[PDB]
Structure 1
């Protein structure tokens, strides 16, 4: 018979980063294996069609990366713009909204992320379709829509609404009455702003916060390096370069030595491409996870616990980092709590009295009914208690009196 109800809350802002894609590369088989050679190309010709499905697989990977970025970011039909006079009830987004006075239109956290995170044998890198300023236009559109409209721009036309009312609904969606917002606007505003500032400092100082971007780049590079390291090894042949083999020998055995090199380099290419295929599969898994986070988390208030930050969920904001996304989830966490004595019913006239919404708590000598996430006690009347039965079958009922607002009025 002991219940502990929190009496004070605290807002929180937490960062979750997800990598979206990788570098779109391509490798030409003949130039890598037999660059600027005639005998080498003739020998490679009789290996059927090995080095066309290599280019097939690599083109598949490249177009797939373009699709990844497209579906992660391009989920807003129009392009919204934030109002010219910023009066958002007290909240201060100046640290996430793009600053026009910037040389490049990227908000300060995006700039911090861009700063924080850091060959010619046919190896080619195709450039991405979307460019970073287009990505900036998308995320600015998403932010302006979710600041002035809410969730309604992802379910039809975009409808405006003040910001304090939008957070009133976002509380009222996790079982906390909205009067707590309309009476603690100032406290919640200050906690919001200081939280964003702490986010800036924490990710600025600690340089290993976003390692799970950097790692990607690192490992990609390693593969490429290993690849070229295979052009200086002789795979059991006489030497490691075609011209010396051709000059110092005759075709009757130059054919054999060149065959050895061809087999070695073909095997190295095969391992490289299969490794890239597996890596692309895992990066697509994370891209789909990012798309779902953007849909159910950025465009709506989600109830799936621990999907969108440890705590009850309020909002989210996206920012773009090189080849990846970073969300700032704004969540809510109860802080200060208190012991109480609880009772599941109240036999008043013999009939039980269960509570419509809220538990039946008490301190030493008075019984109150209060909601379940903020100590706010009201007297017990017949507007928040519904009756069912007679006070026998419940195990734990507790006598009391239940007020009636109609009796004093009829007693005029």
Structure 2
């Protein structure tokens, strides 16, 4: 019987709190398909082929394969629009400065590599290397945007999100030094800038180590790209099934049009051909409907990917777990075959510590509440510190505000409040 997870019981008590004293910069990946292969089917070649009398028999049946061509063209233009919406979100091609020094952060793995003739970062090159004819009227149309243009959009988005923060996504691009952008991002998640500026070297080292581990993990696990591999697998196997259905008997005496024509007179040859063409039309209808359903699902996935690109990348999202586990900081997109891969950089607290807390401090018959933090106590003294980090500070009258007397709240404690 499967085990849901390890037992855990947090020591909840009436007046105790736990506050982190350290953090851990984490990088996670998320793989999203965007579009599949654009295919177009041919009516006459698939249904029977090169028999003119067969086409004469078919043309009086109706305009079914006209509808099929219409639906497949709709699917193809939908795929192109999906790619356009996901990637074409900036109207300028931003270019990184020639000297790549960003206060210790190392972006060599995700920035484009001029050494490669393909102009791709090592991560997306690994992605391309980690993802893997004869046609009877079954055409495969090429996508409008080649891989190079997609890589160009990815490079532009990366340059914009490194050089100019998130401002380029809401107007003109305004440059800003990277450490200040990262301090802004911490200030977004409720941690003051001094925490960053006193830990810039450690944060940079953790970021570099995390991105290296991500590269290695992608290089190692082959099952990570299932969400992209299965799309190609589904398309290929459906196409192969459709091809196999061509040589099916469908209840006729023979599976070959020419043999039926040669060995049989028109009286029953007409009936056999009618049965065969009806069966093949039914199979083609089934394939087209399957393609439509897959197109709807892929379009939903592409819309989700576009939302992620717009929110996690172009800005900072406060939605929980929308852009990775933990508090979101910023995300980097990466191109992939028939999809896109995100690198969510997230802030994760660690090394918690027990403390004794109180709701308010009674002093001179006045109750002082914390203004931006929480009251703690190492056992003897009382300090006020920010919620997400242990930064003890002497309680004063400028980081607290007074409200009412100290006989109405519950759990108030007695202490003094220094005045500067």
Q: What is the distance in 2 between the residues matched to 1:35 and 1:102?
A: 46
* Distance in 2 of aligned mates of 1:385 and 1:236: 87
Tell me the TM-score normalized by structure 1.
0.97
- How far the C-alpha of 1:377 sits from its partner, in A, is 0.5
Residue 116 of structure 2 aligns with which residue?
102
1:201 Cα shift? 0.5
C-alpha displacement of 1:86: 1.1
Query: Offset of 1:10 from its aligned partner?
Result: 0.6
- Structure 2, unaligned runs of 5 or more: 1-14
1:255 matched to which residue of 2?
270
After superposition, give the CA deviation of every residue in 1:211-238 in whole Å (9 maximum; x if it has no partner): 1100110011111001011111111111
- Segments of 4+ in structure 1 off by > 4 A? none
CA distance in 1, matches of 2:57, 2:194: 81
* Aligned residue pair count: 404
Residue 47 of structure 1, CA deviation: 1.1
| Aligned match for 1:270, one of 278, 285, 290 | 285
Offset of residue 59 of structure 1: 0.2
RMSD: 0.6
Question: What is the distance in 1 between the residues matched to 2:246 and 2:115?
Answer: 50
How far the C-alpha of 1:39 sits from its partner, in A, is 1.9
Distance 1:315 1:73 in 2: 17
User: 1:294 aligned to 303, 309, 325, which one?
Assistant: 309
Paired residue for 1:53, among 67, 79, 85? 67
2-structure distance, mates of 1:189, 1:92 = 8
The correspondence of residues 319-398 of structure 1 with structure 2, limited to 5 A, is 319-398=334-413
1:294-353 deviations in whole A, cap 9, x for unaligned?
001100010000000010010100001100000000000001011111011111100100
**For residues 304 and 20 of structure 1, what CA distance do their matches in structure 2 show?**
23
Distance 2:355 2:249 in 1: 80
**Cα displacement string for residues 193-218 of structure 1 (whole angstroms, at most 9, x for unaligned residues):** 00000001101011111111001100
Counterpart residue number, 1:70 = 84
Using the TM superposition, give the Cα deviation of residue 69 of structure 1 relative to its aligned residue in structure 2, in angstroms: 0.3
The separation in 2 between residues aligned to 1:104 and 1:127, in whole angstroms, is 19
- Report the alpha carbon displacement of residue 34 of structure 1 after superposing the two structures with TM: 2.1
Deviation at 1:29, TM superposition (A): 1.0
Partner secondary structure for residue 92 of structure 2: coil
TM-score, length-normalised on structure 2? 0.95
Q: What does the per-residue CA deviation read over 1:151-189, in whole Å, with 9 as the maximum and x for residues that have no partner?
A: 111111000000000000000000000001001000000
Give the drift of 1:50: 1.2
Q: What are the superposed Cα offsets for residues 123-168 of structure 1, whole Å, 9 maximum, x if unpaired?
A: 0011110010000110000000100001111111000000000000
Cross-structure match for 1:407:
none
Match of 2:231 in 1: 216
Distance across 1 between alignment mates of 2:157 and 2:79: 22
Which whole-Å CA distance do the structure 2 matches of 1:14 and 1:380 have between them? 39
- The separation in 1 between residues aligned to 2:83 and 2:148, in whole angstroms, is 14
CA-CA distance at 1:280 after TM superposition: 0.3
Alpha-carbon deviation of 1:360? 0.6
Farther-moved stretch of structure 1 (38-47 vs 112-121): 38-47
Deviates more, 1:40-49 or 1:75-84: 40-49
Structure 1, residues 93-148: CA drift from partner, whole Å, max 9, x if none? 00100011112100000100000010421000111100100001100000001000
How far off its partner does 1:398 sit?
Answer: 0.4
- Find the residue that maps to 2:288 and give its secondary structure: helix
Choose which of 36, 53, 56 in structure 2 pairs with 1:22: 36
1:225-240 alignment, distance < 5 Å: 225-240=240-255
Aligned-pair CA distance for 1:38: 1.8
| CA distance in 2 between partners of 1:368 and 1:186 (Å) | 28
Residue 410 (structure 1) aligns with: none
Distance 1:49 1:327 in 2: 44
Find the aligned partners of 2:149 and 2:372 in 1 and give their Cα distance: 48
